[PDB]
Design a protein around this motif. Structure first.
Motif, PDB file in Angstrom:
ATOM      1  N   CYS A 114       0.839  -1.199   0.000  1.00  0.00           N
ATOM      2  CA  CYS A 114       0.000   0.000   0.000  1.00  0.00           C
ATOM      3  C   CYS A 114       0.873   1.247   0.000  1.00  0.00           C
ATOM      4  O   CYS A 114       1.992   1.214   0.500  1.00  0.00           O
ATOM      5  CB  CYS A 114      -0.937   0.006   1.209  1.00  0.00           C
ATOM      6  SG  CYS A 114      -1.981  -1.490   1.316  1.00  0.00           S
ATOM      7  N   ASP A 118      -2.798   5.232   5.495  1.00  0.00           N
ATOM      8  CA  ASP A 118      -4.233   5.389   5.282  1.00  0.00           C
ATOM      9  C   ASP A 118      -4.752   4.472   4.201  1.00  0.00           C
ATOM     10  O   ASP A 118      -5.887   4.018   4.275  1.00  0.00           O
ATOM     11  CB  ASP A 118      -4.577   6.836   4.944  1.00  0.00           C
ATOM     12  CG  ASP A 118      -4.559   7.718   6.156  1.00  0.00           C
ATOM     13  OD1 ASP A 118      -4.209   8.897   6.014  1.00  0.00           O
ATOM     14  OD2 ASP A 118      -4.883   7.225   7.259  1.00  0.00           O
ATOM     15  N   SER A 119      -3.936   4.202   3.191  1.00  0.00           N
ATOM     16  CA  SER A 119      -4.295   3.203   2.189  1.00  0.00           C
ATOM     17  C   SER A 119      -4.412   1.831   2.832  1.00  0.00           C
ATOM     18  O   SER A 119      -5.306   1.050   2.514  1.00  0.00           O
ATOM     19  CB  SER A 119      -3.265   3.157   1.065  1.00  0.00           C
ATOM     20  OG  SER A 119      -3.369   4.305   0.259  1.00  0.00           O
ATOM     21  N   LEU A 121      -5.075   1.105   5.979  1.00  0.00           N
ATOM     22  CA  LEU A 121      -6.218   1.087   6.885  1.00  0.00           C
ATOM     23  C   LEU A 121      -7.517   0.980   6.100  1.00  0.00           C
ATOM     24  O   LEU A 121      -8.429   0.250   6.494  1.00  0.00           O
ATOM     25  CB  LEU A 121      -6.216   2.338   7.773  1.00  0.00           C
ATOM     26  CG  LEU A 121      -5.078   2.381   8.804  1.00  0.00           C
ATOM     27  CD1 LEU A 121      -4.938   3.759   9.410  1.00  0.00           C
ATOM     28  CD2 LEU A 121      -5.260   1.312   9.885  1.00  0.00           C
ATOM     29  N   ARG A 122      -7.600   1.710   4.993  1.00  0.00           N
ATOM     30  CA  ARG A 122      -8.750   1.626   4.102  1.00  0.00           C
ATOM     31  C   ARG A 122      -8.918   0.212   3.572  1.00  0.00           C
ATOM     32  O   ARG A 122     -10.027  -0.311   3.503  1.00  0.00           O
ATOM     33  CB  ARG A 122      -8.617   2.606   2.924  1.00  0.00           C
ATOM     34  CG  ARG A 122      -9.328   3.966   3.126  1.00  0.00           C
ATOM     35  CD  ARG A 122      -9.619   4.685   1.793  1.00  0.00           C
ATOM     36  NE  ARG A 122      -8.417   4.782   0.975  1.00  0.00           N
ATOM     37  CZ  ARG A 122      -7.426   5.629   1.219  1.00  0.00           C
ATOM     38  NH1 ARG A 122      -7.516   6.453   2.256  1.00  0.00           N
ATOM     39  NH2 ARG A 122      -6.351   5.655   0.437  1.00  0.00           N
ATOM     40  N   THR A 123      -7.810  -0.418   3.195  1.00  0.00           N
ATOM     41  CA  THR A 123      -7.871  -1.786   2.699  1.00  0.00           C
ATOM     42  C   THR A 123      -8.359  -2.765   3.782  1.00  0.00           C
ATOM     43  O   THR A 123      -9.262  -3.552   3.510  1.00  0.00           O
ATOM     44  CB  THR A 123      -6.510  -2.240   2.131  1.00  0.00           C
ATOM     45  OG1 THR A 123      -6.188  -1.432   0.989  1.00  0.00           O
ATOM     46  CG2 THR A 123      -6.615  -3.643   1.661  1.00  0.00           C
ATOM     47  N   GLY A 125     -10.168  -2.036   6.221  1.00  0.00           N
ATOM     48  CA  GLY A 125     -11.550  -1.629   6.414  1.00  0.00           C
ATOM     49  C   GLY A 125     -12.547  -2.385   5.562  1.00  0.00           C
ATOM     50  O   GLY A 125     -13.637  -2.717   6.025  1.00  0.00           O
ATOM     51  N   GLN A 126     -12.172  -2.674   4.320  1.00  0.00           N
ATOM     52  CA  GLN A 126     -13.015  -3.464   3.420  1.00  0.00           C
ATOM     53  C   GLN A 126     -13.285  -4.884   3.931  1.00  0.00           C
ATOM     54  O   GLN A 126     -14.257  -5.531   3.538  1.00  0.00           O
ATOM     55  CB  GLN A 126     -12.376  -3.555   2.042  1.00  0.00           C
ATOM     56  CG  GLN A 126     -12.439  -2.282   1.249  1.00  0.00           C
ATOM     57  CD  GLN A 126     -11.935  -2.481  -0.166  1.00  0.00           C
ATOM     58  OE1 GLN A 126     -10.858  -3.034  -0.372  1.00  0.00           O
ATOM     59  NE2 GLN A 126     -12.726  -2.046  -1.154  1.00  0.00           N
ATOM     60  N   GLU A 130      -9.780  -3.157  10.303  1.00  0.00           N
ATOM     61  CA  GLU A 130      -8.850  -2.021  10.441  1.00  0.00           C
ATOM     62  C   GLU A 130      -8.255  -1.912  11.836  1.00  0.00           C
ATOM     63  O   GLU A 130      -7.121  -1.471  11.996  1.00  0.00           O
ATOM     64  CB  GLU A 130      -9.517  -0.694  10.055  1.00  0.00           C
ATOM     65  CG  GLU A 130     -10.766  -0.391  10.804  1.00  0.00           C
ATOM     66  CD  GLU A 130     -11.995  -0.900  10.091  1.00  0.00           C
ATOM     67  OE1 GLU A 130     -12.853  -0.055   9.745  1.00  0.00           O
ATOM     68  OE2 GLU A 130     -12.100  -2.133   9.882  1.00  0.00           O
TER      69      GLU A 130
END
Length: 135
Positions: A114, A118-119, A121-123, A125-126, A130
């Motif tokens: 990543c 933040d990328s 964490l976003r990943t 998150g999916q 997270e």
């Protein structure tokens, strides 16, 4: 109300530039049919490993990661420009979370780089994951 059948283990590492380590992570996940992922922040940054599957396989994988892989081992790295001797004396691996999931949103086992935290964490998150990462 249904059984909870998936075990889960989570690890965080400082550096995963050794291709021999990546190969071992990948091949053992594949051979054990574990699910989850391995994410890191840029090629040379810190990251996380999540594995999900049965108890036996997750314990084998913990022993692989925590006891058998030499994370501190120096190696020669082949890049776009040349070959360099990497100093890994400061590298380390930690087991953070372990527990059980009722369901997992993971589809296989995958590795990704990543671009920023933040990328990453976003990943996570999916996959509703997270919270597993410590910044």
């Amino acid at each position: 109300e249904k059984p909870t059948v998936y075990h889960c283990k989570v690890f965080q590492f400082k550096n995963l530039q050794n291709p021999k380590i990546r190969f071992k992570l990948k091949m053992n996940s594949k051979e054990l049919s574990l699910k989850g992922l391995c994410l890191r922040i840029r090629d040379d940054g810190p990251g996380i490993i999540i594995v999900v599957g049965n108890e036996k396989s997750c314990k084998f994988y913990e022993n692989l990661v925590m006891k058998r892989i030499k994370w501190n081992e120096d190696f020669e790295l082949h890049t776009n420009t040349g070959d360099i001797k990497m100093d890994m004396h400061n590298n380390s691996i930690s087991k953070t979370w372990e527990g059980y999931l009722q369901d997992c949103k993971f589809k296989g086992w995958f590795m990704k780089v990543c671009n920023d935290q933040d990328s990453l964490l976003r990943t996570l998150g999916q996959f509703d994951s997270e919270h597993f990462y410590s910044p």
